[PDB]
Amino acid sequence: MNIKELSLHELCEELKTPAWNVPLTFVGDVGGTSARMGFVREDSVHACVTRYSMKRKDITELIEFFNEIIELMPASVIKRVKAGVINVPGPVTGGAVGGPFNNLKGIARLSDYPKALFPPGRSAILNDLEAGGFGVLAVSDAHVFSEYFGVMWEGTQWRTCEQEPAGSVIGRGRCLVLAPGTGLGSSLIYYNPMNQQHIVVPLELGSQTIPMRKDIDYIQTLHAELKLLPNYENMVSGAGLEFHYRQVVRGSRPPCSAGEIAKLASEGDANACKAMKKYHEYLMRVGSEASMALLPLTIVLVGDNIVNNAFFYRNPQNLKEMHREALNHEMERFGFQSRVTYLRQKKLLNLNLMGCYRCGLDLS
Amino acid sequence: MNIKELSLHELCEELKTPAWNVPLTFVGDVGGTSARMGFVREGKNDSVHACVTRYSMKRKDITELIEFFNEIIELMPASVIKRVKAGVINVPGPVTGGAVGGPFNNLKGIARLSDYPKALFPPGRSAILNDLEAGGFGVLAVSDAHVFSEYFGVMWEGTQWRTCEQEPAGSVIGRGRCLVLAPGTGLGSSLIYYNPMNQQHIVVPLELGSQTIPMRKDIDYIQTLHAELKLLPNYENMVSGAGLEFHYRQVVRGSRPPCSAGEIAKLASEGDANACKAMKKYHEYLMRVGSEASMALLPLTIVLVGDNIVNNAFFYRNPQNLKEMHREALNHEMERFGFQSRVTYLRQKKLLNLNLMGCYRCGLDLS
Ligand SMILES: O=C(N[C@@H]1[C@@H](O)[C@H](O)[C@@H](CO)O[C@H]1O)OCC1=Cc2ccccc2S1(=O)=O
Ligand SMILES: O=C(N[C@@H]1[C@@H](O)[C@H](O)[C@@H](CO)O[C@H]1O)OCC1=Cc2ccccc2S1(=O)=O
């Protein structure tokens, strides 16, 4: 369960090790700023990758990186590749065509990828949160769930469906993965009770139109500013957090960035704290509506910033407020939102790289 | 693809015939008012043959099914019961673990697989399905029998279809996710997810009807219903029998007393302007389920199913209605990127109990 980020040439030497004369899975975690790519081996799951800059901000650059890797590597090494899986930050169809993306131009095309790294019949392109969901499965299968995930609150259904303590395994029930970061990501780890298998269903929840509660004025305010009917991502993003802060201060303080707002909030600033609560009020609305639509056993909040903002979740007041909002739905009169166990990532981990590898296992 | 509805003693008789001397699947399609239950076999070549008896849910209680199962085990040869390889039923509410169903909004009690006789529900080969989960398996059953174009018609073809397929739209389910919607008494939904890595379709039950409706330019109309219900409206409140009745009341404005959803559809078929407008309003909200789900679930196809959909073909047959629905399906901020236009919409155009076919089709994966 461990990953070292190495130089390209260090990597080449690492794979020359006897401990890497085994079948290999090629993996790639592609962001809009940079991309980490490398290999994973076998009861240990070990990965070493190297990083590239998405300098041109064009998804087709990946091809050059692939080619370079094949060049700066011995055929003994390459010939061991049994699977190749990458993830990209946009919708993907057929597991083979990714994009368009709003951070990058171009289209990820598996058919254009080198087959030394992407063996035919053993390769895939994933959506980033698709990979992330596979990552969650990987953590659960490594028996290390409680090390990376903390229970925010246990739902009504957990103890009936599961014998293990909440937070100690993923559970034999649907898990909705949400990643409120740059973009708002979402995937459903569906559980098939007939074959007892989990499958990862990519979703675009963030782009749904926000349904109201008692906030028509606040939504119209954003609508007027965006010139678009607000979707969840508009409220639950960096840009969303900046919006919430400006609406709190009313011009009494200068406008700050998301990172800065979050930093201030950690320092204890009331304006920034109010901003974070507003943001999470809308994140919980994604949860309450999806709790009904998708009937999950668990909802898991993932991503670096979820870990780096642990301070917000540890605060029992905030937690209580988020819980109240998670149950703010008409169907809670029947207990639907109460059914669901909410968890948060509490320790850093690249779920996406682990997910690429695990997806590879279902292929090979 | 065929189902015959018989009497209990009648049913009991035909199962003693040589055609039925084959492994059987016990199935049951359970509704608020009635339940159809019986046996299904594979036929030549890819065909499916069901023999069922009607049961009225007179006690409005889901646990009465238990009595029915008993009545079938006692009153039927043990030689027939021995042929039972799987047992699958569907119920009109959410199901957890394929074993615990309910609660239901039109029936009392909880459907419990553990409380069912093992004779009709063999251990390891049995399940309780949500009705639209069974419906989704039924859509697969039609696809598997090469008869998709007999039961489903294209309303409009989406951008993505030809990108993924050479055959014409409506001729196959297609190698992509299929969202099944059933606007009937309640609004049903399931996603036939498509896993492109193993080319497998898998049915994922949903409760899209109970989501709060997001707005377009209709805040006053949503608020009008809010004031009647004392609840923020969900899609089912606008798309259901009660929803159609509300739309009719809003169209007429007291000027005519209220009539039933069924009465309203009949009037619409006879060209009554007010009922037609009510039906248009109903479909405006159904298309909003569609547009939002088109984004959230990224489906290749959306299929409207149910006796309702079939019997009200007069509505979909009309080009003006279809054009107004199409427009509403595209009414979403994300259509500026073409997401809603990607999707092909289809409708059931021939009566078939998808649920019974689905219970059978699900039973195949268990046996
Ligand atoms: O990219 C998206 N959705 C993405 C998801 O796939 C991804 O899992 C998460 C997290 O990385 O971020 C979302 O934003 O949808 C397509 C587009 C949304 C959007 C928003 C504003 C402008 C353009 C576009 S788009 O590229 O059509
Ligand atoms: O029953 C449900 N949902 C059902 C679905 O499972 C089903 O597929 C469709 C189609 O038949 O009907 C929906 O209504 O959700 C739970 C309930 C909703 C509801 C609405 C009003 C009163 C009570 C209740 S409930 O039984 O909690």
Side-chain angles (χ1 to χ4, degrees), chain B residues 231-283:
Chain B
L231 302 166
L232 280 180
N234 61 32
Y235 289 112
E236 189 174 79
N237 294 138
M238 295 285 202
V239 189
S240 58
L244 182 59
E245 298 163 351
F246 168 79
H247 297 309
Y248 188 74
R249 294 190 309 263
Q250 296 306 300
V251 166
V252 302
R253 301 193 165 278
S255 93
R256 306 173 211 288
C259 37
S260 66
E263 276 150 18
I264 292 158
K266 172 165 192 299
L267 283 163
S269 68
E270 300 164 357
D272 181 82
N274 287 336
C276 283
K277 200 170 165 181
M279 196 135 290
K280 286 169 187 41
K281 211 61 176 169
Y282 172 108
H283 286 85

Side-chain angles (χ1 to χ4, degrees), chain A residues 331 333-334 336, chain B residues 92-94 103-105 130-132 186-188 207 236:
Chain A
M331 298 295 285
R333 79 193 185 273
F334 307 121
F336 281 102
Chain B
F104 310 102
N105 94 309
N130 164 265
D131 61 346
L132 263 293
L187 172 58
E207 293 289 336
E236 189 174 79

Side-chain angles (χ1 to χ4, degrees), chain A residues 138-211:
Chain A
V139 176
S140 188
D141 291 334
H143 320 94
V144 63
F145 219 69
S146 62
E147 174 172 323
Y148 289 95
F149 297 106
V151 170
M152 295 167 73
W153 60 84
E154 181 189 288
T156 256
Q157 206 166 245
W158 182 262
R159 288 172 183 260
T160 313
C161 302
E162 278 298 328
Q163 294 325 114
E164 308 273 44
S168 71
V169 292
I170 184 179
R172 287 160 304 181
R174 300 141 79 135
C175 172
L176 173 67
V177 182
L178 304 176
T182 290
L184 170 60
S186 58
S187 67
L188 182 66
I189 305 164
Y190 173 73
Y191 181 65
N192 186 353
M194 287 146 32
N195 66 353
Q196 289 209 323
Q197 287 197 236
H198 278 283
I199 71 160
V200 184
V201 176
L203 301 169
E204 291 296 331
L205 301 189
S207 293
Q208 299 172 107
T209 312
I210 304 178

Side-chain angles (χ1 to χ4, degrees), chain A residues 89-91 100-102 127-129 179 183-186 203-204 207 233, chain B residues 295 334 336-337 339:
Chain A
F101 312 93
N102 76 315
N127 164 265
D128 64 341
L129 262 291
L184 170 60
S186 58
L203 301 169
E204 291 296 331
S207 293
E233 182 168 76
Chain B
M295 187 62 243
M334 296 298 286
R336 80 199 188 262
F337 306 119
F339 284 102

Side-chain angles (χ1 to χ4, degrees), chain A residues 91-95 99-100 124 126 130 134 157 174 188 190 192-194 199-205 207-213 216 223 227-229 231 289 292-295 329-331 333 336 339 359 363, chain B residues 94 96-98 102-103 127 133 137 160 177 191 193 196-197 202-208 210-216 219 222-223 226 230-232 234 292 295-298 332-334 336 339 342 362 365-366:
Chain A
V92 175
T93 63
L126 268 24
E130 184 177 13
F134 277 111
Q157 206 166 245
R174 300 141 79 135
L188 182 66
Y190 173 73
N192 186 353
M194 287 146 32
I199 71 160
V200 184
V201 176
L203 301 169
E204 291 296 331
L205 301 189
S207 293
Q208 299 172 107
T209 312
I210 304 178
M212 68 169 183
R213 290 300 184 267
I216 167 80
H223 185 182
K227 306 177 184 59
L228 297 169
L229 262 193
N231 64 32
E289 296 289 346
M292 190 64 239
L294 312 182
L295 300 177
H329 196 286
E330 301 289 8
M331 298 295 285
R333 79 193 185 273
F336 281 102
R339 293 180 175 204
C359 173
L363 291 179
Chain B
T96 58
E133 178 175 22
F137 280 107
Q160 201 178 63
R177 314 172 174 86
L191 179 64
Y193 178 63
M197 296 171 295
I202 103 105
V203 186
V204 176
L206 298 177
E207 293 289 336
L208 299 183
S210 296
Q211 305 169 103
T212 310
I213 305 180
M215 287 172 176
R216 292 300 187 271
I219 176 158
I222 290 172
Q223 285 185 350
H226 188 174
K230 264 60 159 47
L231 302 166
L232 280 180
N234 61 32
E292 298 292 345
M295 187 62 243
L297 311 184
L298 295 182
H332 194 288
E333 296 291 7
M334 296 298 286
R336 80 199 188 262
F339 284 102
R342 297 181 178 196
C362 173
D365 297 324
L366 305 177

